[PDB]
Amino acid sequence: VRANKRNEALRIESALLNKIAMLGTEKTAEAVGVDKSQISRWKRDWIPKFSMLLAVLEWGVVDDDMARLARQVAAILTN
Amino acid sequence: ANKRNEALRIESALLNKIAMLGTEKTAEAVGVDKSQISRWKRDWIPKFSMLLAVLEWGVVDDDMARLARQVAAILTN
Amino acid sequence: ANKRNEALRIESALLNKIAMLGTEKTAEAVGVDKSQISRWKRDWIPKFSMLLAVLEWGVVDDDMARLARQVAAILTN
Amino acid sequence: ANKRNEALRIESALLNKIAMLGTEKTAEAVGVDKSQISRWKRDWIPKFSMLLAVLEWGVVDDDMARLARQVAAILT
């Protein structure tokens, strides 16, 4: 299927949820630091949001953008 | 301890990418309200980074490396 | 593509930090009463912003700054 | 140094740019009455200069300058 934002976020979400479940909700929820209670608000609201962030970040940039960034940075780093 | 550093390494990579895309644009694409951007970066990214470290999620800062090179070039010529 | 953009781009950047700082000092720094500091930002910031743009004032945004440091940190090995 | 000296340092740089562009060229390119250039250099520019000092503009500029040097060093 074509690359779709909603769809990639979902894919990421499932992959994160998988890992979490393999390492155990409780074990990870603590290894991270969220009240054993918040796990629900967590799994239902942030994971999706984080997933979307990861999807957007992976969607990334194109050569033109990088080149522009390189020039802009080069300018700030010159005397 | 191992996760602490990894967490920070991941955070940096995430923060770097967000910067390469633009904080404003990224926030918009991700659905985080402009008013939350700060809370987003000082609080949530770090948390998510730890999760990613615990989950042993693969994260690389290749983009920052590439940009550093490209910049190092235009800086010499 | 011109100065109006630049002026805006600087105005934001200012407004961002003018709050990311607090209208307690922002009020002080300009010898302006705090019961008007909000109005003042409307009547002047845009002006001052155009001035800075005209003067070709070097204003770097948080993303470029970060990228610069990360790049520097890489290059300075 | 402190705020007052950082303001003055800002002010002077602003005035310098304004002098290189012409007090009247910039006067309009900005959009202020050619008569108001008076109040601007002796009233508002100082104020604005303090603000930029407080908002720490330049502290970033200094940092970037430093980095640019340290980079230029290890570079060539």
Curated annotation (Swiss-Prot), chain A:
Keyword Transmembrane helix: no
One of the GO BP terms on file: regulation of DNA-templated transcription
Coiled-coil segments: none
Annotated transmembrane regions: none
Keyword Transcription: yes
Residue ranges of the annotated DNA-binding region, renumbered to this chain: 25-44
Protein keywords: Activator, DNA-binding, Early protein, Transcription, Transcription regulation, Viral latency, Viral latency initiation and maintenance
Molecular function via GO: DNA binding
Stated role: Acts as a transcriptional activator that allows virus to initiate a latent state. Following infection, participates, together with cIII, in activation of the Pe and Pi promoters, which are responsible for the transcription of the cI (repressor) and int (integrase) genes, respectively. Both of these gene products are required for the establishment of latency.
Other comment: Lambda-imm434 is a hybrid of bacteriophages 434 and lambda. The cII protein coding region is in the lambda portion of the imm434 genome.
Family membership: Belongs to the lambda phage cII protein family.
UniProt subunit comment: Homotetramer. Interacts with cIII; this interaction is essential to stabilize cII that would otherwise be quickly degraded by host protease FtsH.
The protein, known as: Transcriptional activator II
Residues of the full protein shown: 2 to 80 of 97
